[PDB]
From a paper:
Ribosome-associated quality control facilitates the degradation of incomplete translation products and requires dissociation of the stalled ribosomes. A central event is therefore the splitting of collided ribosomes by the ribosome quality control trigger complex, RQT, by an unknown mechanism. We propose that the Ski2-like helicase 1 (Slh1) subunit of RQT applies a pulling force on the mRNA, causing destabilizing conformational changes of the small ribosomal subunit, ultimately resulting in subunit dissociation.
When bound to the ribosome, Slh1 adopted a bi-lobed arch-like architecture formed by the two RecA-WH-Sec63 cassettes. The C-terminal cassette (CTC) is packed on the NTC and connects the RQT complex with RACK1 (Asc1) at the back side of the 40S head. Densities for both Cue3 and Rqt4 were positioned between the two cassettes with Cue3 binding to the upper convex surface and Rqt4 packing against the concave side of the Slh1 arch close to uS10. Moreover, in the C1 conformation, direct entry for the mRNA into the NTC helicase core, as observed in the Ski-complex, would be obstructed by rRNA h16 that resides at the interface of RecA1 and RecA2, occupying the space where RNA would exit the helicase. In addition, in the C1 conformation, the helicase core of the NTC is in a constricted conformation, mostly resembling the apo/unengaged states of Brr2 and other related Ski2-like helicases. After recruitment, RQT stably locks onto the 40S of the stalled/lead ribosome in the C1 conformation via the Slh1 NTC, placing the Slh1 CTC in a position primed to bind the 3′ region of the mRNA emerging from the ribosomal mRNA entry site.
Residue numbers in the entry:
A (entry chain AV): 1 to 87
B (entry chain Ab): 2 to 82
C (entry chain Bm): 1 to 25
D (entry chain AC): 34 to 249
E (entry chain Aa): 2 to 98
F (entry chain AW): 2 to 130
G (entry chain AX): 2 to 97
H (entry chain AR): 2 to 95, 100 to 126
Write the structure that this text describes.
RNA sequence: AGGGGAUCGAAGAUGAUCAGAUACCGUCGUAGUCUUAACCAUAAACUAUGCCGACUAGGGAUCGGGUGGUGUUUUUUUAAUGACCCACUCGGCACCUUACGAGAAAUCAAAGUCUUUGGGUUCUGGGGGGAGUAUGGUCGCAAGGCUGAAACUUAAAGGAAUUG
């Protein structure tokens, strides 16, 4: 947050899970952060460039991490018809 | 699954589900056009009879009641209406 | 003692107290 | 000398990590207590109580002492550690290493009209350990920490000045009461609030930018 | 505390089971709770077969068998080198040896 | 039997949001369910939702963003006086800066913040945060 | 429903249920039944006066081995005989 | 009993770990050589190590021994690790795809040589 | 996106089908596996190899995105994947773990076998649960080769394959190595066949 | 209160054991056990878990009904049925895994959606004894059932797990 005159307070604004919009707490050890590489016209990965996906430990514990990343990766252009909205 | 189109289920899934548990419930029965031998006298029967339906002119047999779908006669032509 | 036989002991006692009290009315 | 053996420990000596919130942001596990000492040198420790636990054996009872120690600077960080040892001094020393490894941030907020310097908790929070339930409610200015002396000074070391408290269960169990309060304060950052609804670019973990300073 | 989920027996939706008598001590025990064992043995022995063959007309007769269903109570089974006692985690296994 | 259809509507939303589901189906889609949902969506707590018109009562498919923490009904619907809203706001809202005690008044269904502006109170329906 | 009625017209059931259930409270039961007025040899009063009738050497319970030096007093206002303690070292000599 | 302790066993295994192209299957040579490559504070222990080394050498002569890796067997075991066939078991010898698999082939927009054989319950 | 040269080539579908990578498990099915395609008679479910390939490429992109090759860890306890992981670590940094896992290789920072990987690759989640369980303690992503009945808890992007057969297990390890090398640029030509024989990653019983 | 009364068998009689043994073991054996008409109204009558309603994780099996499949076998190779196999489904008795969650724990798919405390409703409890006792009612032929205290006394009784 912040006080009446700018001066942002509440240090450490935390991350939110990509698949659930849920805060990844500082003690969540099941949560992971996936980095997937990019390619430029040659099939060679560009070092230092990633599409980053953060998943909370709740979905990973429920077995829905794999499915949620299929939806997440398909709609970012780096995947294909493996995932379908209509189940 | 945590995400899915609950508004447009596939026709395969709606086919398997119970009639009351589809997106909008509807009957899975139908009506037939029975070709009784002899006179044309086309008769309409339900998929589930609950009664021994017989033709108006020659009322021998057209279908027999059953726990589920009605059983048509041995010699008979039919088309779903 | 067993709760079963404390139930039995008290019932016998209530028999007599229902009988000695009948000697007066 | 420290000579750590951990990827996170190597980054601390290299100086690539300067704020402990950078550890909190990426949920990096802490397995070496010198990381907390290097990042947070201003934390203070104190022991609530020492109690003897005894094991029945073929020849007499085996007495050991349980040490409950709370660490943390008075600005936004606390850690709670519990350890048993056959000596009281050894348990207290070992109960400080555990306490530092579990340092967590507290989300402070205002009871209203945010003039500045958050003086209370942002939201209602609760923590349950065993039968003990500890509830914390934001309080106006000057009301202090309305709590029992054991719970109060844990909140004093958290940087919270004004708060209300309600307790349940066998609160005379000091170990579970502090564990229930430690859960409640840690939950202040797990509660999503409308001012945190904004999206973020999901920054890259420091373990990738500084991979050259790893073990290999 | 509750030792077992079934609590001794196989009664879930029966109400009453109309018990049977123990074959060793005549104790009454509900049939589901009983420890039924089936005893199927040859008519003579594994040792008398050698002498009952040549001393028999109708060579290789049948070697017939005896069939008997035995019921034991909880006490009679434990005392007879049967289902005696297991550990807390071994108690949950229902597979025969 | 079904006593209140709003409780089943809100409990299904809570159970859906606990698992992380982006959507949930609500039956049988009363009016006050729509009015309650419209307030939640006005403040950005649910998002889009869809009404399915079967001929009996209707169904609702609600798209759920991850912003919602708890929606609940208050049963019975107590009569809330104008000065007692601060009491209800105090008991069952997380903080003084966010959260709405949705109550039904003669001027439609609206949260306590809008009720204060209009200076009108009524019966309490529920809460959202 | 977690037990108790919640209906907005269920005030009588809740009020009567609480009234019936308060009789399990020792203080509520003792106060309304008037046990202090009809028992507890005082008349519900803090102090009372009487006449010493005997000097008693009541022996303490276990684990404890001593003699307590109590007295037997008959209340003036009621006439009931009660036992009272004479607390201090050597104060039984003033209450002959 | 004649069960040998870890001191007899670990030392015997360590010698074999690095002295295979060395001391043979004979105890007399074994004990005359172990005291030259390793120092032991007592003769009784030095005899047990040489006796167990002789015993473990014989087990090596007939197949490998689990937990023992000397210079000669690790290079031989890795030498056969690159062995590859010439038939190319994944290469086509004629492929047989069932009816359901045949539906997969054309669905992906790919043409393959297929010999469909029906399979039924 | 992709330059559209990463699609399933006709020769790739030869190896997948000749190795029977498309033959999934029996009617026992997990709801977390929509990769099933047109269940065959006799109960066998045919896996959509088109989904296997695209998922396999996604796994390879993640492996090539890790700054250090040695921070990848390949774990296989099954006897059919013990050879495959070792040679996967022959052509890639990918520090391997073949055989037992030694519970405490990711926690217990003082242990001899301590490793700190940024990604873990496992063959069978069911038999490799100990590796998967500890990865949930130190914020480590996990890539698995999941059959149609394999568990999917704490498992990130997974490659649907046939873990029952030895031909399918080794082929996926062979494939994954080939694409990660291509993404890194070691294999200069995308259309090159990588003459290294696919039966290199294939277990031998003697 | 009639009928019936084989078997087993409160009581009782006996043999034995025992320091004693009016018990356990053995042999007899009355009431009872069985039935008809009428009472009794209890039980660890237990799932020690009130009823109605909604939602929340996976898996197989089974019972009843239904649907589909050129599916297998018997009639009349051949149809329909019947019995099996595969898929789905509604309802039931349960079962396996896990812990999102709950619990003091044992454990629990409900004993979950309960300090982020409210779907509807019924009943019961308020430290351990005295005590389910006294007394007064009411029901029963009786045995007894239901309702049900107080004086007094006490600092612990009690639940689940831990190590001996
Ligand atoms: Mg209390
Ligand atoms: Mg017991
Ligand atoms: Mg009303
Ligand atoms: Mg005492
Ligand atoms: Mg009763
Ligand atoms: Mg019963
Ligand atoms: Mg069923
Ligand atoms: Mg069925
Ligand atoms: Mg049933
Ligand atoms: Mg009380
Ligand atoms: Mg009481
Ligand atoms: Mg106990």
């Amino acid at each position: 947050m912040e006080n009446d005159k700018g001066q942002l307070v509440e240090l450490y604004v935390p991350r939110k899970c990509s698949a659930t919009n849920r805060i990844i707490k500082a003690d969540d050890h099941a949560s992971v952060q996936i980095n997937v590489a990019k390619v430029d016209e040659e099939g060679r990965a560009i070092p230092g460039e990633y599409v980053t996906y953060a998943l909370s430990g709740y979905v990973r514990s429920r077995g829905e991490s794999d499915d949620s990343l299929n939806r997440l990766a398909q709609n970012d252009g780096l995947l294909k018809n493996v995932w379908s909205y209509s189940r | 699954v945590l995400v899915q189109d609950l508004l447009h289920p596939t026709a395969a899934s709606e086919a398997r589900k119970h009639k009351l548990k589809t997106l909008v419930q509807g009957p899975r029965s139908y009506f037939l056009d029975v070709k009784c031998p002899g006179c044309l006298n086309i008769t309409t029967v339900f998929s589930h009879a609950q009664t021994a339906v017989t033709c108006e002119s020659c009322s021998t047999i057209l279908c027999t009641p059953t726990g589920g779908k009605a059983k048509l006669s041995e010699g008979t032509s039919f088309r779903r209406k | 003692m067993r709760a079963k036989w404390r139930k039995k002991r008290t019932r016998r006692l209530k028999r007599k107290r229902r009988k000695v009290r009948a000697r007066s009315k | 000398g420290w000579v750590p053996v951990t990827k996170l420990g190597r980054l601390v000596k290299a100086g690539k990590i300067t704020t402990i919130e950078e550890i909190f942001l990426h949920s990096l596990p802490v397995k070496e207590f010198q990381i907390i000492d290097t990042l947070l040198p201003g934390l203070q420790d104190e022991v609530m109580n020492i109690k003897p636990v005894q094991k029945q054996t073929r020849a007499g009872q085996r007495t050991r002492f349980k040490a409950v120690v709370v660490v943390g600077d008075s600005n936004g960080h606390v850690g709670l550690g519990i350890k048993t040892a056959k000596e009281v001094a050894g348990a207290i020393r070992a109960g400080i290493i555990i306490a530092k490894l579990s340092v967590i941030p507290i989300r402070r907020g205002y009871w209203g009209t945010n003039l500045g310097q958050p003086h209370s908790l942002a939201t209602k929070t609760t923590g349950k350990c065993g039968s003990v339930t500890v509830r914390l409610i934001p309080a106006p200015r000057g009301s202090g920490i309305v709590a029992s002396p054991a719970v109060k000074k844990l909140l004093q070391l958290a940087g919270v000045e004004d708060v209300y408290t309600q307790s349940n269960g066998k609160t005379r169990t000091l170990e579970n009461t502090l564990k229930a309060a430690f859960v409640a304060i840690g939950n202040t950052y797990g509660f999503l609030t409308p001012n945190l609804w904004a999206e973020q670019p999901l920054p890259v973990s420091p373990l990738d930018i500084y991979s050259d300073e790893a073990s290999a | 505390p509750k030792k077992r989920a079934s609590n001794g027996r196989n009664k879930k939706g029966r109400g009453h089971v109309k018990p049977v008598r123990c074959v060793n001590c005549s104790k009454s025990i509900p049939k589901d709770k009983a420890i039924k064992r089936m005893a199927i043995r040859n008519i003579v022995e594994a040792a008398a077969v050698r002498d009952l063959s040549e001393a028999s007309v109708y060579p290789e007769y049948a070697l017939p068998k005896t069939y008997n269903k035995l019921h034991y109570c909880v006490s009679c089974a434990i005392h007879a080198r049967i289902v005696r006692v297991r550990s807390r985690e071994d108690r949950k296994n229902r597979a025969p040896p | 039997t079904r006593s209140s259809v709003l409780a089943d509507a809100l409990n299904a939303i809570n159970n859906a949001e606990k698992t992380g589901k982006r959507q949930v189906l609500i039956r049988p889609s009363s009016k006050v369910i729509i009015k309650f949902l419209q307030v939640m969506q006005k403040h950005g707590y649910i998002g889009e939702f869809e009404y399915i018109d079967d001929h009996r009562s209707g169904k609702i498919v609600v798209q759920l963003n991850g912003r919602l923490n708890k929606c609940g009904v208050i049963s019975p619907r107590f009569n809330v006086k104008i000065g007692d809203i601060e009491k209800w706001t105090a008991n069952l809202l997380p903080a003084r800066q966010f959260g709405y005690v949705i109550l039904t008044t003669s001027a439609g269904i609206m949260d306590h913040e809008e009720a204060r502006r209009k200076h009108v109170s009524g019966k309490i329906l529920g809460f959202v945060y | 429903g977690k037990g108790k009625p919640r209906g907005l017209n269920s005030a009588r059931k809740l009020r009567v249920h609480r009234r019936n259930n308060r009789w399990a409270e020792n203080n509520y039961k003792k106060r309304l039944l008037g046990t202090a007025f009809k028992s507890s040899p005082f008349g519900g009063s803090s102090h009372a006066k009487g006449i010493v009738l005997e000097k008693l050497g009541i022996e303490s319970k276990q684990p404890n081995s001593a003699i307590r030096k109590c007295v037997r007093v008959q209340l003036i206002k009621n006439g009931k005989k009660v036992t009272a303690f004479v607390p201090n070292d050597g104060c039984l000599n003033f209450v002959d | 009993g004649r069960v040998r302790t870890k001191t007899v066993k670990r030392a015997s295994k360590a010698l074999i770990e690095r002295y295979y192209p060395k001391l043979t299957l004979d105890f007399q040579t074994n004990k005359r050589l172990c005291d030259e490559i390793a120092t032991i504070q007592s003769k009784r222990l030095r005899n047990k190590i040489a006796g167990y080394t002789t015993h473990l050498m014989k087990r090596i002569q007939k197949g490998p021994v689990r937990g023992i890796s000397f210079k000669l067997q690790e290079e031989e075991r890795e030498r056969k690790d690159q062995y590859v066939p010439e038939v190319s078991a994944l290469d086509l010898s004629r492929l047989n795809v069932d009816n359901q698999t045949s539906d997969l082939v054309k669905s992906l927009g790919l043409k393959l040589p297929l010999s469909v054989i029906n399979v039924s319950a | 996106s992709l330059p559209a040269t990463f699609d399933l080539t006709p020769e790739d579908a030869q190896l997948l089908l000749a190795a029977n990578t498309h033959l999934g498990a029996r009617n026992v099915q997990v709801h977390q596996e929509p990769y099933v395609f047109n269940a065959r008679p006799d109960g066998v479910h045919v896996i959509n190899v088109g989904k296997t390939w695209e998922k396999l490429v996604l796994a390879a992109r993640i492996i090539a995105a890790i700054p250090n090759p040695e921070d990848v860890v390949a774990i296989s306890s099954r006897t059919f994947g013990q050879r495959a992981v070792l040679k996967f670590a022959a052509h890639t940094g990918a520090t391997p773990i073949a055989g037992r896992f030694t519970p405490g290789s990711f926690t217990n920072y003082i242990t001899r076998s301590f490793k700190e990987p940024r990604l873990v690759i496992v063959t069978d989640p069911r038999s490799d649960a100990q590796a998967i369980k500890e990865a949930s303690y130190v914020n480590i992503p996990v890539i698995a080769l999941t059959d149609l009945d394999s568990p999917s808890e704490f498992v990130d992007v997974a490659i649907p394959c046939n873990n029952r057969g030895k031909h399918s297990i080794g082929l996926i390890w062979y494939l994954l190595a080939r694409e990660v090398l291509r993404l890194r640029g070691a294999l200069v030509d995308r259309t090159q066949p990588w003459s290294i024989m696919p039966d290199l990653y294939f277990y031998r019983d003697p």
